[PDB]
């Protein structure tokens, strides 16, 4: 996936995969935690192993798409309304300026 | 807890902590971050700014930047990109607001030329001259005098006229002037490697040193270019006397300010070791030589390139004879009637030179009266520390550290042998001294690999660390004091708005002297601390 | 990063099978919160089994939003989509 | 472009790539014997034009990076002698589905 | 000590029956808590002579084969005896 | 939550009160229906907005702009005249710039007769 | 009044991992820990005023409140403290990092010792957008190592050398670090070494028992020395050293301890006092509560008395104690423990980096591996007349196995009743939760009845386990993609879990001791999820082979092989009762013409099995099929169709009527693609 | 009084799906706003209009829909210097707390521009002038100048009033001020 | 709690868990590993994301910028466990809605 045969075993698993949570979820937890925090990795919240820790809704799978309902209403009634409070009193200051 | 000291506002911010408040204490506003972020991360690009600061893009970016330019608060570099066009990356001027950070002390630099008119409107004149200068920083007698009334004798309204030159005062900013030094050396490192007429491809030394020679001697006339330029100094129009060149704007001359205050120190330290007669003699003698001595300026080249453990001395040697001989022509041989308050026979009275002995001066042309110079200022610098810790912390720390000077990496028995009092105190003073820098530590493995209590504990000077910690001092009030100045603004900020435009209430009357003489305490308290800081920041 | 015109649809018009998943489950929890059902409901109950009965009739008034990896969005209504 | 014979001194590598506008290509003589491209295993790689690349990104609406890569100085890549950010369309012919292709970039 | 938010019954009954192991009062039917959260699995002249004092104490104690528990009585007494300075003036035995 | 525009359209009450008599007429229409908590504002809405007009009209709003565009009232008193200070005497000049001095007599007087058209 | 209050539902974007500043630590903490250990024993058992355990820092058992946030074990999440620590003490978690952060900086003026263009070169390499993680690290190495070859710093003018991580890894005193002047190149003129021999010259002279006898020590950097040395790192490089700076955390200073934050009390749970007066302690609090000890030692020591020599071992011993505090690493190299020692070498002094590390260590098995409520466990037993896509869940667990329900509309006329039974009998519920969300209502008190007469629409009742509900089901050692399979749950008597044997092969359950893991979900969308996705019928094929894992085994195979067998026959009766017993009732049927005629009448197995596929007219299962089963004897090569063979032959079927051959695994036995069921599905 | 363009999201529970969309929208809008006071603008009167209804995006955890629109609603911030009806209310002497019935009590006009000739007498009179006192509940023309918005919600665990969120101030700068029959 | 006897709870191991991912069930994880597992709401602060309690962000003391959200209590546990040790996995947040 990146440049070469690598990965699997922890030592190659630092390749692209950027999520410090799961990199600790496998092997060499500690030095990934610290050594991470030192280098101040900006990280991201993405993978399964990621998103179950923080416990929010999974990215892929069932959650691979948002669900939406339509309001099903016409913009005809979205038109504004007034008696034009502004417009009638406009022309007072329009003189001598 | 409970914020009363507020270590936040303090403890965790080295160095730039001063700067970002200074500019803040100056501007803040839009202008705050750009210097802060700059000195923080270093080299920075216009486009590169707003991807960090969120600083009102390409306006306050441009605005604050040209602001600093006008006031020369930045170091400024542009070059073509490697593909083409042109790119501009930016640094921060010297210590920048360092200029502002003296100000009133730079106002004191006038007190040298306070002479020739004492306590005159001329004083107030040159005053508004200088601060108007320093607010903008680059002006012309064409621009200034232009703004000034044209109905007050030209050679007087602006009375400082020929006196514009002197030693300090102003020099036109040109090119390199606020251009970053460290690189512009490398810019000169071109044209020598870059101009090699395909001579021989061997021993880059012949390529280097020669280029270095060029790089050296070319750089000389480079920095000697601002040192003096006649077209300013020389101009004498018709029916007139010699004037500056009114045309180009000139800018505050920081060198003779350095040499001046450093002088003032020497007045104090020498004044400590000698008598006010011999002292004031030394004082008035230095008034001439402080003209010629770089004294902080020599680094320059040292800054910006790796030394070489030999070639480092190949720089040092240049500092050995430099002022001593050729500027020695400008230096003390026979000087005549400096001031006098003494009277009657002035000659052997002037032989009071020889009263100079230790630990400085007292080297002359074996039968003319002369003080060593370019050798003087350097080994002078090494001595300057001395007193710096006594009521700083404790009397006893002196003698031990002083002893720690002469001996080196000994130990406590040989201390307590040499030293006195009691281990009860000896540890305290030492331990309370080790709590920061000074002694450092030395230890060696004793009948083990390395173990906790077996080995021996030794002590060392390392003024490298010492002379380089007194910045922690900078981090104290020069850090803080500026805040409680600023923090006290928002106290009266409402009144500050009103009270400033008034010329009312009893507490107002009270808090006038409170906040104001309070400002005396802070500002004066600062300059107090500054006179101490005048050293370890530079030499 | 906005709505794609209905005229152009790059997608498979069939179900996702996680379509069936979230469409059903969502519609169910809606039923559990007492929302009006769109179908004749036989003598039985519970949200899930009657929701199944709804998608049999394809009466769900919902649209699966779909994220292309570039953030180019997407829209499919149930009634648009085919089993 | 020139090849070594049997020794590749690191002094030659200290500055290998002098001239920026041109470039260099290095190999060992013994190293190059039968062309890797024509061997068997390496299927055919196709260098693709800049406009072709940007067009490919128009297709999949992909920003840069985020692609299978090729480590610079890959011998096969060296056989084609790529440069930075250059993309190859590699045609794998394997009997599973059949002949088809994918892409890689030179990192 | 705790009282219901509604019925305000002063007595709570714990239900271990179904292995919810909850707590609710016969006055309401509104539980007190969910899943009671449970657990599982220096040098001073006085203190040192308390070390030695336990050493002597226990040793010579069950030299008689006296019950271990009873020894801790005297251990307090001995400690109590330390308070009034009755201990120092004479032999330890 | 988020505000696109705070100072947007300066709006006094003309039929706005009657508009709340509309949505009110739409929802539950007060206690006059005898012949959601929302009524809390409704009483407060109709509270003052009703009395000073007595101690109303529609087309008067159109009659509002007719001679009133002629003055320097800006929008401030120009809108304020609709309700407060029944355009009389010192009331009307107590606010806006130069309703006296520069332009005074006919300008302050027409306010008295024009307000008699509505209030 | 009534200030407008808004909320937004949120979610995480990434995590920034930095270190706290000095101040930010205490900026969090409520109290100084300080004091001493003792748990201030008077008036009480560890009333623990101030000290390590503090009631305002947190709570331990359920008695008292947290002061800071009262509401005790229920509502208080704990709070952090702040340990003032005499002298700067080093830090092990950054140790191997700290050797690097110091590695590229001189000991003299302490400036980043690579410089000029090349500095900017690396810089401009990094900030390019396309630069990434592996590039972050690898590059930071390519810049890091580039420092070592520099012998001399720049505007300091002084040289330096490499630091080796002194001694080995025994960790005892090993955390001390050493570099030195190096590369004498024979004898050279080095003002460092020049002075150096001009230095020892006097102390050599004074104590000549020692110097050359123990020599070649180089020199260290003390954690006190190095805190200084860090502070004059000037802004700038930062990310060059690998640390991103923009006035938040605090440049490379923090990474050595100054104020150790007290771990919040809940994460320092005081173990049950477990009767008597002596409460079972908790470890880390013992550790730091000694760290206070040695702390105030070196704070009152070094303040007036003691000595430089009696000093350090307390202090180095301290950094061994905090390093020991956050990790195991160096364990007890005959170093012995402190106050409350023992010294028969109690093994597991370790409390911490462990508790986060392996196996039962949280961050795998106690967090990603959470042991989850609402479940059940039992042994198994076969139930063939139970349909596939169920599990028989015994009533006795259904009584305690509950499901959350939000009553609505259609629900009442069931749910209003389902209460009247109560928790005792099965078709009932126990817990009730009203629309007013007070706490919850457990069937204990009494009532119901007039209670159920209330029942707001928005209410909540927790049902028991009713007929044909949603369930998901497991076996202990997760093999592959069939680990969990939902079921419509049907309740039956006795006590055990009972599934349909044909689904054993995914679980490879031998019955016997096998103990399954029974789950019920709670939230709705998860139900329709599991059943209508993860469910049996949908997963009826196992993915890897693209094959129908679930099918008949053993009996059902061999049983088929008997009814399928050619030598069999059946009459009007026998076939009738069979076709009955095949689907217990419930179905109309049709009888194909009898396999034979005027010599009576009969039907063969091939037919009666044919109806098993297509029992009726209205049966939408028109099938053709053919294949080899196993135990196939090829005919004479003359006969071209292998359909006619010595033993049976190709199973072959057309229009869902068996033509020839016994079935026997093969077609119905998984194990292949060509299949009865796989063709069907 | 006036109008403002503001945006927000509303959670629509499933129930109201039977009811009109936009109407139930408005319903929950006033349920959220109505009388409620909105900081650094001035109090919301009620919804005026509504616009940009968009297809609602729900969350997985719930299933009850969410719709973020914007709209222009009626707020109350007339202008600084002004004269308006109201009356003294709970008060002592210096300054008076003027109010209109049912709206809010926060209007308090201190006394600076209020006529220097005055006298207070702890009994029905705030200040009497050379022209006299004034009455509670009375229609009273008074001037306002400033309103200052405050959060004042530093909820502390140790803490367990001062709600001057939208509060108006002024004085009596001319005649007819504080009592309407002085003018008129 | 642990196993049989004392009282119940059953073991979703990692190797056991991930079997659900092959079916890719979003919510089944949540209800299973979250809503029925450790039901908790952390309160945090957008500015300098950190985990307060009730209405405070503590170290930055505001009692305003807090957002309430639900998280596995094992998560916050792991945090404080970290932030006990010097480290900062500051949680920055953002809306679910408006894209
Ligand atoms: Zn109760
Ligand atoms: Zn608390
Ligand atoms: Zn250096
Ligand atoms: Zn915060």
Torsion sign over Cα B304, B307, B312, B317: negative
Residues of I in contact with G58 (CB under 8 A): none
Q: Where are the alpha helices (DSSP H) in B51-203?
A: 60-70, 98-102, 104-113, 121-136, 141-147, 154-157, 181-189
A70 to chain F, closest Cα gap in Å: 23
DSSP annotation of H9 = E
Asked: is C1-83 a CATH 3.90.940.10 domain? The reply is yes
Which SS3 state, helix, strand or coil, does residue I70 take? strand
Structure tokens at G148: 């070592």
A31 touches chain G (CB under 8 A): yes
Start-end of H helices in chain E: 45-62, 68-83
DSSP one-letter string for A62-75: GGGS-EEE-----G
Query: Quick check: G370 and I31 CB within 8 A?
Result: no
Q: How far is A47 from chain G (nearest CA, A)?
A: 11
Q: How far apart, in whole angstroms, are the C-alpha atoms of residue H59 and residue B363?
A: 87
| Cα-trace Rg, chain E | 25
- Is H75 in contact with H38 (CB distance < 8 Å)? yes
I26 contacts in chain C (CB < 8 Å)? 22
Rounded CA separation G215/G197 (Å): 12
I13 interface with C at CB cutoff 8 Å: no
Look at C22 and H18 and tell me if their CB atoms are within 8 Å: no
Reading the block at residue G178, the tokens are 């050493």
Query: Is G283 annotated as a binding-site member?
Result: no
Chain C residue whose CA is closest to H13: C33
Other C-beta atoms within 10 Å of B127: how many? 13
Q: Tokens at residue I10, please?
A: 């059953």
Q: Which domains does chain H carry?
A: 1-76 (3.30.1490.120), 82-182 (2.40.50.140)
Tally of CA atoms within 13 A in the half-sphere of G312 that contains its CB? 20
In this complex, which of I54, I63, I98 lies closest to H154 when CB atoms are compared? I63
Say if strands I88-90 and H98-99 run parallel, antiparallel, or are unpaired. Answer: unpaired
Q: Which ligand does the CA of B306 lie closest to?
A: 3
Q: Which residues contact H5 (CB under 8 A, 6 or more apart)?
A: F3, F4, F5, F8, H70, H71, H72
Provide, as residue numbers in chain G, all residues whose Cβ is less than 8 Å from the Cβ of C25.
Answer: 524-529
B67-97 core/surface letters (b: 16 or more CB in 10 A; e: else):
bbbebbbbbbbeeeeeeeeeeebbbbbebbb
Q: Do chains D and A touch (3 or more CB pairs under 8 A)?
A: yes
Structure-token pair, residue H54: 């968009």
| Resolution stated for this PDB structure, in Å | 4.5
Of residues H53, H60, H72, nearest to A57 (C-beta): H60
List C-alpha distances in Å: G230 to B14, G105, G223, G225, G233: 10, 9, 10, 9, 5
What is the whole-number distance in angstroms between the Cα of residue H105 and the centre of ligand 4? 35
Per CB-CB distance under 8 Å, the chain A contacts of I24 are 58, 60-62, 64
- Measured N-to-C along each axis, helices B276-289 and B255-273 cross at an angle, to the nearest 10 degrees, of 160
Do A55 and I78 lie within an 8 Å CB cutoff? no
The answer to whether the beta carbons of residues H37 and G3 sit under 8 Å apart is: yes
Q: What residues are paired with H104 via a beta bridge?
A: H100
Element (H, E) at B378: helix B376-383
DSSP output for G22-48: HHHHHHH-SSB--S-SGGG-SSSS---
Of B24, H142, A30, nearest to G93 by C-alpha is: A30
Q: Give the distance from CA G122 to its chain's centroid.
A: 39
CB-based contacts of D65, cutoff 8 Å, min separation 6 = G130, G132
Q: Which chains touch F (3 or more CB pairs under 8 A)?
A: A, H
To the question of whether residue G106 is assigned a binding role by annotation, the answer is yes
Q: What is the CA radius of gyration of chain H?
A: 22
Q: Is G53 helix (H, G, I), strand (E, B) or coil?
A: coil
Range of the domain at A20: 7-65
> Is cis: bond before B359, omega within 30 of 0?
yes
Task: Return d(Cα G418, Cα G459) in angstroms, integer.
Answer: 14
Cα separations in angstroms, B214 against B169, B184, B217, B314, G580: 30, 14, 5, 15, 112
Torsion of CA C4, C6, C12, C14, to 10 degrees: 130
Rounded CA-CA distance B45/H117 in Å is: 65
Which two structure tokens, joined as six digits, stand for B301? 């080249």
Q: Which of A34, A37, A62 sits opposite I26 (nearest CB)?
A: A62
| d(C-alpha B324, C-alpha B302), whole Å | 20
Q: Which one of E24, E39, E43 has the shortest CB-CB distance to G442?
A: E24
CA distance I90 to E39: 30
Q: Does domain D35-107 have CATH number 3.90.940.20?
A: yes
Experimental method: cryo-EM
* φ, ψ for residue A64, nearest 5 deg: -60, -10
Q: Does D96 touch chain G (CB under 8 A)?
A: no
Supply G445's token pair. Answer: 């008190």
| Token pair 């604050």: residue | B64
Distance set, CA I74 to CA G37, G368, G520 (Å): 29, 9, 22
Closest in C22, C61, C66 to A62, CB measured: C22
Chain breaks in chain F (C to N over 2.5 A) after: 35, 55
Structural domains for chain G: 1-91+242-359 (no CATH), 92-241 (no CATH), 360-401+464-547 (2.40.40.20), 402-463 (3.30.1490.180), 548-681 (no CATH)
Chains G & I: contacts with CB separation below 8 Å: 215
Return residues with CB closer than 5 A to ligand 1 (ion): E 4, 7, 9, 25, 27-28
Question: Do chain C and chain B touch with ≥3 beta carbon pairs under 8 Å?
Answer: no
Cα C23 to Cα C10, C28, G13, G108, distances in angstroms: 21, 8, 26, 68
Q: Which of B407, B386, B130, B143 is nearest to B268 (CA)?
A: B386
Using a CB-CB cut-off of 8 Å, the residues of chain H touching A69 are 55-56, 58, 65
Q: Is D30 exposed, middle or buried (0-12, 13-18, 19+ CB in 10 A)?
A: exposed
Q: Rounded to an integer, what distance in angstroms lies between the CA atom of residue B161 and that of residue B336?
A: 26
Q: What is the whole-number distance in angstroms between the Cα of residue B298 and the centre of ligand 3? A: 18
Is H26 in contact with F22 (CB distance < 8 Å)? no
Give the position of tokens 């152009």: C8
DSSP character string of I73-97: HHHHHHHHHHHHSS-EEE--EEESS
Task: State the nearest Cα–Cα gap between G456 and chain H, in angstroms.
Answer: 14
Q: Which of G245, G113, G225, G227 is CA-nearest to residue B17?
A: G245
Distance, in Å, from the CA atom of F89 to the CA atom of F117, rounded to the nearest integer, reads 16
Q: Strand C62-65 and strand I66-70: pairing? A: unpaired
Chains I and D touching, counted as 3 or more CB pairs less than 8 Å apart: no
Chain G residues inside the 8 Å CB shell of A59? none
3 state SS of A39 = helix
How far is D77 from E39, CA to CA, in rounded Å?
62
**A64 token code pair:** 């691979």
Q: With a CB-CB cutoff of 8 Å, which residues 3-62 of chain D face chain G?
A: none
DSSP G261: P
**Burial (CB count <10 Å: 0-12, 13-18, 19+), residue C5:** exposed
On chain G, the residues whose CB falls within 8 A of the CB of H32 are 4, 6
Query: Which residues between 11 and 40 in chain E have a beta carbon less than 8 angstroms from any beta carbon of chain G?
Result: 13, 15, 18-20, 22, 24-31, 33, 36-39
Given a contact cutoff of 8 angstroms between Cβ atoms, the answer to whether F72 and F98 are in contact is yes
**What is the C-alpha to C-alpha distance for residues G131 and D85, in angstroms, rounded to an integer?**
12
Cβ atoms of residues A16 and G133 within 8 Å: yes
């Amino acid at each position: 996936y990146k440049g070469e045969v690598l990965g699997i075993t922890r030592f190659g698993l630092s390749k692209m995969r950027d999520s410090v949570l799961q990199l600790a979820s496998f092997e060499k937890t500690t030095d990934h935690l610290f050594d991470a925090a030192f280098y101040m990795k900006k990280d991201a919240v993405e993978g399964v192993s990621e998103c179950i820790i923080l416990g929010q809704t999974m990215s892929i799978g069932t959650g691979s798409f948002k669900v939406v309902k339509g309001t099903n209403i016409s913009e005809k009634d979205l038109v504004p309304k007034r008696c034009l409070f502004e417009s009638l009193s406009n022309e007072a200051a329009l003189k001598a300026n | 807890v409970m914020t009363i000291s507020s270590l936040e506002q303090r403890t965790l911010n080295p160095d730039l902590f001063l700067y970002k408040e200074l500019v803040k204490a100056h501007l803040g506003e839009r202008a705050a971050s750009v210097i802060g972020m700059l000195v923080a991360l270093g080299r920075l690009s216009v486009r590169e700014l707003v991807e960090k600061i969120d600083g009102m893009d390409v306006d306050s970016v441009k605005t604050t930047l040209v602001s600093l330019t006008q006031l020369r608060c930045v170091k400024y570099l542009q070059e073509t990109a490697i593909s083409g066009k042109k790119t501009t990356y930016y640094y921060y001027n010297e210590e920048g607001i360092h200029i502002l950070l003296y100000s009133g002390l730079i106002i004191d630099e006038i007190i040298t030329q306070m002479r020739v008119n004492d306590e005159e409107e001329h004083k107030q004149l040159v005053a508004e001259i200088v601060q108007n200068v320093i607010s903008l920083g680059s002006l012309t007698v064409e621009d200034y005098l232009s703004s000034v009334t044209s109905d007050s004798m030209k050679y007087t309204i602006s009375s400082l006229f020929v006196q514009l030159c002197e030693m300090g005062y102003l020099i036109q900013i040109s090119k390199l002037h606020y251009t970053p030094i460290e690189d512009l050396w490398q810019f000169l490192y071109e044209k020598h490697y870059k101009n090699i007429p395909r001579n021989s491809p061997l021993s880059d030394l012949k390529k280097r040193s020669q280029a270095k020679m060029n790089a050296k001697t070319d750089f000389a006339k480079i920095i000697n270019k601002p040192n003096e330029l006649s077209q300013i100094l020389t101009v004498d129009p018709k029916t007139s006397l010699r004037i500056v060149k009114p045309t180009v704007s000139l800018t505050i001359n920081l060198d003779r300010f350095m040499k001046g205050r450093r002088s003032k120190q020497l007045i104090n330290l020498a004044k400590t070791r000698v008598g006010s007669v011999t002292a004031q003699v030394y004082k008035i003698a230095l008034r001439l030589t402080e003209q010629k001595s770089p004294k902080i300026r020599d680094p320059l080249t040292q800054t910006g390139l790796l030394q070489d453990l030999e070639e480092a001395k190949s720089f040092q040697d240049e500092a050995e004879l430099v002022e001593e001989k050729t500027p020695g022509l400008t230096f003390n041989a026979i000087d005549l009637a400096r001031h006098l308050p003494s009277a009657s026979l002035i000659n052997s009275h002037l032989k009071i030179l020889a009263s100079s002995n230790f630990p400085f001066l007292n080297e002359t042309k074996p039968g003319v009266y002369y003080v060593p110079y370019s050798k003087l200022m350097p080994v002078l610098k090494s001595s300057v520390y001395e007193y710096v810790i006594a009521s700083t912390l404790g009397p006893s720390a002196m003698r031990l550290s002083r002893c720690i000077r002469d001996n080196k990496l000994v130990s406590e028995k040989i201390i307590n042998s040499t030293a006195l009092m009691k281990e009860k105190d000896i540890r305290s003073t030492l331990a309370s001294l080790i709590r920061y820098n000074s002694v450092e530590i030395q230890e060696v493995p004793r009948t083990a690999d390395r173990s906790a209590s077996r080995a021996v504990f030794l002590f060392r000077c390392k003024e490298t660390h010492s002379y380089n910690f007194m910045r922690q001092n900078l981090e104290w009030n020069m850090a803080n004091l500026l805040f409680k100045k600023e923090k006290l603004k928002q106290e009266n900020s409402t009144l500050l708005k009103k009270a400033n435009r008034d010329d009312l209430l009893p507490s107002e009357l009270n808090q006038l002297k409170m906040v104001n003489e309070r400002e005396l305490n802070v500002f004066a308290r600062l300059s107090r601390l500054l006179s101490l800081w005048e050293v370890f920041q530079m030499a | 990063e906005k709505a794609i015109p209905k005229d152009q649809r790059a997608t498979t018009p069939y179900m996702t099978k996680y379509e069936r998943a979230r469409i059903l489950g969502t519609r169910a929890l809606q039923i559990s919160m007492n929302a009006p059902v769109f179908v004749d409901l036989e003598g039985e109950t519970d949200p899930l089994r009657i929701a199944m009965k709804e998608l049999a009739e394809k009466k769900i008034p919902l649209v699966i939003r779909r994220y292309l990896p570039d953030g180019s969005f997407e829209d499919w209504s149930v009634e648009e989509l085919i089993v | 472009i020139f090849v070594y014979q049997n020794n590749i001194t690191p002094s030659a590598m200290k500055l290998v790539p002098s001239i920026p506008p041109a470039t260099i290509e290095t190999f060992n003589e013994a190293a190059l014997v039968v062309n890797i491209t024509h061997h068997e295993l390496v299927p055919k790689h196709i260098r693709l034009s800049s406009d072709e690349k940007r067009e490919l990104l128009k297709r999949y609406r992909l920003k840069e990076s985020q692609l299978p890569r090729i480590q610079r100085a890959d011998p096969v890549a060296l056989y084609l002698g790529l440069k930075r950010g250059e993309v190859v369309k590699i045609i794998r012919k394997s009997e599973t589905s059949g002949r088809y292709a994918s892409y890689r970039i030179c990192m | 000590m705790p009282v219901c938010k509604n019925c305000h019954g002063t007595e709570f009954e714990r239900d271990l029956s179904n292995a919810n192991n909850d707590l609710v009062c016969k006055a309401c039917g509104v539980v007190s808590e969910d899943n009671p959260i449970v657990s599982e699995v220096a040098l001073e002249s006085r203190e040192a002579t308390l070390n030695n004092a336990r050493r002597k104490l226990r040793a010579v104690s069950y030299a008689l084969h006296i019950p271990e528990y009873i020894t801790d009585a005297a251990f307090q007494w001995y400690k109590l005896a330390l308070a009034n300075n009755f201990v120092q003036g004479r032999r330890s035995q | 939550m988020k505000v696109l525009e705070e100072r947007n359209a300066f709006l006094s009450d003309y039929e706005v009160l009657k508009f709340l008599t509309d949505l009110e007429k739409k929802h539950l229409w007060d206690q006059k229906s005898l012949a959601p908590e929302l009524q809390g504002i409704t009483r407060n809405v109709v509270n003052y907005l009703s009395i000073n007009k007595n101690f109303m009209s529609d087309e008067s709003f159109a009659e509002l702009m007719t001679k009133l565009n002629s003055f320097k009232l800006f929008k401030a008193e120009k809108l304020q005249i609709v309700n407060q200070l029944p355009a009389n005497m010192v009331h009307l000049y107590s606010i806006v710039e130069e309703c006296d001095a520069r332009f005074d007599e006919k300008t302050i007087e027409e306010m008295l007769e024009i307000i008699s058209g509505y209030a | 009044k009534e200030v407008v209050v808004s909320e937004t539902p949120k979610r995480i974007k990434g995590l920034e991992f930095s270190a706290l500043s000095a101040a930010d630590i205490v900026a969090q903490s409520e109290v100084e820990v300080s004091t001493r250990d003792l748990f201030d024993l008077e008036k009480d058992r560890a009333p623990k005023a101030n000290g390590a355990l503090d009631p305002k820092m947190g709570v331990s058992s359920s008695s008292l409140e947290c002061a800071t946030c009262h509401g005790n074990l229920a509502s208080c999440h704990g709070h952090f403290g702040h340990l003032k620590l005499a002298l700067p003490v080093f830090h092990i978690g950054y140790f191997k990092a700290t050797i690097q952060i110091l590695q590229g900086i001189c000991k003299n003026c302490s400036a980043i010792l690579l410089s000029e263009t090349d500095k900017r070169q690396f810089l401009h390499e990094l900030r390019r957008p396309g630069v990434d993680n592996l590039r972050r690290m690898g590059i930071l190495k390519k810049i890091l190592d580039q420092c070592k070859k520099q012998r001399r710093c720049l505007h300091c003018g002084a040289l330096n050398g490499v630091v080796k991580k002194a001694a080995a890894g025994a960790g005892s005193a090993a955390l001390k670090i050493i570099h030195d002047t190096f590369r004498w190149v024979g004898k050279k003129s080095a003002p460092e070494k020049d002075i150096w021999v001009g230095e020892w010259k006097e102390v050599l002279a004074h104590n000549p028992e020692l110097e050359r006898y123990v020599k070649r020590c180089m020199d260290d950097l003390n954690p006190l020395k190095t805190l200084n040395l860090f502070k004059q790192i000037k802004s700038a490089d930062c990310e060059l050293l690998g640390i991103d700076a923009t006035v938040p955390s605090g440049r490379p200073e923090t990474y050595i301890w100054r104020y150790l934050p007290a771990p919040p009390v809940c994460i320092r749970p005081s173990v049950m006092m477990q009767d008597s007066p002596a409460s079972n302690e908790d470890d880390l609090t013992v550790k730091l509560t000694e760290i206070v000890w040695t702390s105030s030692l070196i704070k009152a020591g070094l303040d007036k008395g003691i000595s430089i020599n009696n000093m350090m071992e307390h202090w180095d011993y301290l950094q061994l104690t905090v390093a020991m505090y956050i990790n195991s690493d160096s364990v007890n190299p005959a170093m012995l423990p402190g106050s409350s020692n023992g010294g028969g070498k109690v093994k597991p002094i370790r409390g911490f980096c462990q508790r986060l590390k392996g196996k039962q260590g949280r961050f795998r098995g106690n967090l990603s591996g959470k042991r989850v409520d609402f479940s059940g466990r039992t042994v198994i037993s076969p139930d063939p007349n139970l349909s596939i896509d169920e599990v028989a869940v015994p009533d006795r667990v259904a009584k305690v196995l509950t499901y959350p329900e939000k009553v609505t509309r259609y629900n009442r006329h069931k749910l209003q009743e389902l209460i009247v039974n109560g928790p005792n009998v099965h078709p009932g519920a126990n817990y009730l939760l009203k629309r007013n969300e007070d706490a919850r209502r457990n069937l204990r008190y009494g009532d119901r009845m007039k209670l159920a007469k209330n029942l707001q629409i928005g209410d909540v009742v927790e049902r028991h386990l009713e007929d044909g509900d949603v369930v998901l089901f497991n076996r202990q050692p997760s093999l592959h993609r069939l680990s969990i399979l939902s079921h419509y749950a049907k309740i039956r008597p006795w006590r055990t879990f009972r599934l349909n044997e044909c689904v054993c092969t995914p679980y490879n359950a031998d019955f016997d001791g096998d103990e399954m893991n029974l789950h019920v979900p709670q939230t709705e969308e998860a139900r329709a999820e599991a059943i209508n996705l993860m469910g049996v019928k949908n997963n009826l094929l196992t993915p890897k082979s693209g094959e129908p894992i679930i099918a008949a085994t053993q009996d059902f195979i061999t049983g088929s092989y008997l009814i399928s067998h050619k030598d069999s026959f059946y009459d009007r009766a026998t076939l009738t009762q069979l076709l009955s017993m095949m689907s217990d009732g419930i179905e109309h049927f049709d009888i194909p013409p009898p396999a034979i005629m005027k010599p009576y009448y009969l039907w063969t197995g091939k037919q009666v099995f044919s109806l098993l596929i297509k029992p009726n007219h209205n049966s939408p299962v028109v099938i053709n099929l053919d294949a080899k089963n196993k135990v196939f004897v090829p005919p004479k090569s003359k006969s071209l169709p292998n359909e006619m063979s010595q033993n049976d032959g190709f199973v072959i079927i057309r229009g869902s009527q068996i033509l020839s051959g016994v079935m026997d695994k093969s077609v119905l036995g998984d194990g292949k693609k060509h299949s009865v069921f796989y063709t069907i599905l | 009084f006036i109008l403002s363009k503001i945006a927000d999201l509303v959670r629509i529970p499933p129930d109201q799906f039977h009811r009109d969309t936009i109407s139930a929208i408005t319903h929950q809008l006033n349920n959220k706003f109505a009388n409620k006071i909105i900081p650094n603008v001035g109090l919301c009167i009620t919804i005026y209009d509504l616009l940009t209804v968009e297809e609602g995006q729900l969350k997985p955890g719930d299933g009850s829909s969410y719709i973020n629109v914007t709209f222009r609603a009626v707020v109350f911030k007339p202008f600084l210097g002004e004269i308006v009806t109201g009356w003294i209310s709970k008060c002592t002497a210096e300054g008076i707390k003027v109010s209109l019935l049912g709206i809010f009590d926060d209007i308090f006009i201190p006394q600076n521009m209020l006529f220097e000739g005055c006298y207070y007498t702890p009994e029905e009179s705030a200040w009497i002038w050379p022209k006299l006192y004034f009455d509670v509940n009375e229609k009273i023309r008074f001037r306002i100048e400033r309103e200052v918005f405050v959060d004042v919600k530093p909820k502390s665990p140790k803490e367990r009033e001062k709600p001057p969120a939208y509060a108006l101030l002024g004085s009596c700068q001319t005649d007819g001020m504080g009592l309407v029959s002085w003018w008129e | 709690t642990e196993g049989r006897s004392r009282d119940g709870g059953l073991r979703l191991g990692e190797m056991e868990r991930d079997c659900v991912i092959a079916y890719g069930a979003s919510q089944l994880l949540l209800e299973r590993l979250m809503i029925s597992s450790d039901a908790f709401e952390v309160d945090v602060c957008d500015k300098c994301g950190l985990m307060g309690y009730s209405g405070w962000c503590t170290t930055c003391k505001s009692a305003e910028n807090i957002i309430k959200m639900t998280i596995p209590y094992a998560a916050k546990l792991l945090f404080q466990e970290l932030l006990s040790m010097n480290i900062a996995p500051r949680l920055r947040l953002e809306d679910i809605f408006q894209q």
